[PDB]
Amino acid sequence: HRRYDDQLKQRRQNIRDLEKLYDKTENDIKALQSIGQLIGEVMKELSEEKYIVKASSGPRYIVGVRNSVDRSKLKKGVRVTLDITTLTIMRILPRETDPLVYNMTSFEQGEITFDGIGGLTEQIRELREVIELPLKNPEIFQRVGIKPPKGVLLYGPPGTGKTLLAKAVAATIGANFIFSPASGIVDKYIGESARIIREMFAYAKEHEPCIIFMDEVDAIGGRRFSEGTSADREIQRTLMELLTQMDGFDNLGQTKIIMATNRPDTLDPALLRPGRLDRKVEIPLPNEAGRLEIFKIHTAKVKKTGEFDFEAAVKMSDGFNGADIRNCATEAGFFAIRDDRDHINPDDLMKAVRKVAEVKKLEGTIEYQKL
Template sequence: MKYYKICTGDIVAVCKGEGEDIQKPGDEVQAFSLSGVTFPKAPPGLPSLRHLQEAGTIRLKEISNPVSNVTSHTAEGKQRDWLSLLLREFDLKYITYAQILEVEYEGHKRRFSVTSISTQQSDLENQEKLVDKLENLSIAAQSKLWVVGWDSSVLISGIDAHEPAPAHKQEIEILAPTSAITAYSTVGGLNKQIQQIRDLLEIPLTRPELFRYFGLKPPRGILLHGPPGTGKTHLARAIASSTKSSVLVINGPELSSAYHGETESKLRDVFRQAREKSPCIVVLDEVDALVPRREEGAGGEVEKRVVATLLTILDGMEEGADGEGRVVVIGTTNRPNAIDPALRRPGRFDREIEIGIPDAEARFSILNVLLSNTPHSISQEQLRAFSSRAHGYVGADLGAVVREAGTIAIKRWLASPDGQKDHNQIPENLTLTLDDLVASMPAVRPSAMRSLFVETPPVRYSEIGGQALVIQKLREAVEWPLLHPEAFQRLGVRPPKGVLLYGPPGCSKTVLARACATESGVNFVAVKGPELLNKFVGESERAVREIFRKARAASPSIIFFDEIDALATSRSASDSDTGSSHEGVLTSLLNEMDGVQELVGVTVVAATNRPDAIDSALMRPGRLDRILYVGPPDEGARVEILKIRMKTMTVEPNIDIDALARLTDGCSGAEITALCQEAAILTMQMDINAPYVSAKVPVFCK
């Protein structure tokens, strides 16, 4: 025993000339023939052990009475995993059929019997089908000795025999296949993306032999990325359910687990199910939560192991002739840069398809889908016009708009006499109207713009007096590209990228920018220059990049930089203390407006009363193309301003506006507005019950 390093209780092979026998402690004196194992080169008087075959999958069955009844699938799965781990760590070098293993779990001893042993991991499917047959066979005729190695796995069939796919009912959703027409009818505005994905999926899943004929590897994965609410998950589910393949939908966060090795085990089980159900599509929703970047500080050891496991699984999908080309992975995320770069290469995620912000035509298609089951009285022309006004709205936003409009229609009917009479009967003429859609838009902001300072200023050009030339230039720069894009394409020119409004304070520069956004109907982002400056290195530049990124996502949009001289100070004029900070912000502005990435759908409107302090690189054509002077109003402009201001005031009927315009020579628009305000205050001081502002107020008599 010392020579072979064995002790009491070990399993030993005894040579008897015709083969080898196994004798277990406590058994009667008998031997099981192992004719396939021989012991060559035995020393005199003693047999010599040889290298036995390593066990791949060891299947056990519990023969002891269960200590408790486990009703929860999750608890049952954890019990099975813990028992498998305990048995896997069992100090055992050799194993054979019918061997009894005993472990202690939660204070109770559990006994398991070996029912089957396979050599390869791929034999698992066949072993599951033959478990019952193996149990009925004679062990004496099947006995053989195996080596328990590091790659040996342990499965327990007694606990989860009733559950074919354990512990994943909540994480995995199986979709029933439907026809392509039915599935795609619920997706609007993504026809181009649908065609791309169908070209990538349908042939590999239906005719994989064509790829093998040409010696090509079919696509293994597709990554759908884009802003939130654009329909990535909805598109993945629709395409998956439209094929005749099996579909497994996995939510990345739900698959994650705090237990050591449990997430990796779930991943392997998911793809094992996919191979069993081949052809199959696996949809990994929010894949960035499952496989984040493995850079330092980006995640812990658990995340790194999960990423490595998924990489191994995706590479291993190419092996096996039976299932080759029959399993495809679709990942969805709104943070593609948060995914580990190793996944974003051909052979894993072969193609990356962006699901961007829908344009006017796509919004029209989405609204048609959303209103298909809603009674409405909106014509196609009205719906198309409404779609062209919903700039920056994604599919989820439009769904919220329709839901809000439906609520308005319901409240309108409930407030009517018919709605108050009978609450149990719904009239047939209760429909959604265009006014309901328009009224619901202010309550729903575009998703991409909610984290920014966004406002819809209710200012019109008609409320601004004396700036007809500036208003016309603003219309040409902002409204014409939206209303007449074919004219720009026909003439081969690009619309202006930026407009600079400069002039003395109080001459309606900011009001002009607000009115421009209101009249054009685009999203408006107001940025105050000093608010972007941050004392931490790189934060000011990051804030500038983030503003432009979200403005692009919600395009067409206007970014209004008020007091831009605080951000884009001339590099020659900046002092040594703040020069580096301002230069970084200025460089970010220059790159965003006219850098490698083209600025499309975003117009920059800036205002300042110190144009000499702005860096000259920002004021060249291609960045701030149009530089408009907004000066003090002349006499005719002052007449317009006084008329506009007095429309909302109660003034003496015979007041001479022309005389007031002559008296206010040299005043700005803000000073004229303040003059009218002061006249009203003085009138109240003279007589709090005055019916109107008198023309004899001292302010008007100066």
């Protein structure tokens, strides 16, 4: 009696799979009947039923309206949806101008924390006052009467963890952040770099808890006035846009500007003036007491012997930065591979530190011309 029933139960797996494919294909034909619709921003208002919306293709047209939309949201500064044939307003959408995914992706996955940035504790509280303090309790600045600092400058020798300060805040505060590299906005067609900058600050009025960073700007942060220079107007006007949002009458106060650079001398002296970057946070080379904490950070996940002394590499370290200390633990791992050792010999740790000391040979000291 159950012989024929078992053959019918096995067919039920195929029937349920076809039933999902019957409505999926049927919904595809219904989607093909819908055509495209233009998108434009409302400029002015001519009549009640007649508005002027600038098309995305670059010309302008006088479009219509219908009874399916609210005329209150059709005012100026609102991006609407036009028609590709009749050229009439269809729907109403929020303003989105080039939502670049690379700048909006902050890598929300937690990796570096306040423990891995250790040794900078003296300079860590500098960012907490210009970031954590105004966002958590903005009323403190109103009691004394001081204005909340907008821009913050990060400069110093490379490899000291200035970039790690950007990743440590994203994994703790949790606010929406935007990574803005210097070479990502330099795309040029016609006045493109000046428009992209206005696109990043356009999200400041939408999402209030936002802080826009800047990654190692050696180019568009300088002054470089115009003499010759093979038509630099795109980079020249790029500097004018970064000095606009932090200057003109537009008021935000919830947006902080974190600018990182390898040296203040390559930055526009006008940008260094107060009113744009209020506080300049310097990240110099850690002291002898600050280096010892760094060795324990990189070797925390490294398997080695139970007896360990990192005070030897403290004196061995001369002019090293937070990054070069990581290379000492990386190079020491290959010394035990030739001897077939899972745990790294503490004596081999000093071999890599002495090796890294001969890797530089180039500069390594900036003093008089660095603030």
